[PDB]
Each structure stands twice: as C-alpha cells, then as structure tokens.
Amino acid sequence: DPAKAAFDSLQASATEMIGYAWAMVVVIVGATIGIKLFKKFTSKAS
Amino acid sequence: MSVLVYSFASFVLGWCLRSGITYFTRLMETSS
Amino acid sequence: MSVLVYSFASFVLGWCLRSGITYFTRLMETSS
C-alpha cells in the first residue's frame, strides 16, 4: 500500500526529532527549577 | 479506508510523543 | 519520498526558530 509506506517513513523521522526535543527540555528545565529553589531557600534561611 | 486508518494513526503518534514531555514538565514543577 | 522529507524538514525549522524566543522570555521572567 502507498499509504502504509508513507506512515512507515514518517515514524523514522519522528523518532529522531523526539530525541532532539528531549535533550533541549532537560537543559532548560534544569535551569528553571534550579533558580526556583535558590529563590525559595534563600528567603527561608533569611 | 487505508488512507483514513493511516492518517489517524499519524495523529495519535504525534499526540503521544509530545504529551510525554508535558507530563515531565508538570510532575517536576509540582514536586519542586 | 522527497515531498515527505522536505515538508517534515519545514515543520522542524519552524519549531526551532520560535522556541528560541520561548526560552529567552522564560529565562528572563524567572531570573528577574
């Protein structure tokens, strides 16, 4: 089927893209939560 | 009905892959 | 499968260019 072939090719490309997205998210979220905790603990200690 | 079947399958694939990340971000924010 | 390859490439280009700005705004808001 031409359409089965289409979906199969799409799956490969999508898998790579999801891989890149996971890498970005980790770095950004690391920073965000880091800053949040810094602000929190500094204020409680003071 | 091959076209319909494989185009719908392609919507559900994109919904699953992204929502994975939506759950990470959420669970993280709340926990911290 | 040229059409598929180059249309998907065009989705990923738009995702990258915009998200750049999403990160600027976020990092700024939190830092301040």
């Binding site: 289409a6 799409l10 | 185009s7 392609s10 994109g14 919904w15 | 598929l4 998907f8």
Partner: peptide
C-alpha cells in the same frame, strides 16, 4: 499524471496530521 498527484496527497496528509497531533499534545 494522476498517480503523481495521488502520491503527493497521501504524503502531505500524513505530515499535516502529525503536526496537529503535536499541537494537541502540548495543551495543558
């Protein structure tokens, strides 16, 4: 040729339903 057009339609369709899926997924 009709067949060229046919194949193109299918290919574009698959990608467009993926993108709408992705958008649906990031809705909080």
């Amino acid at each position: 040729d009709f067949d060229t057009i046919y194949q193109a339609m299918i290919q574009i369709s698959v990608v467009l339903c993926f993108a709408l899926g992705i958008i649906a997924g990031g809705q909080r």
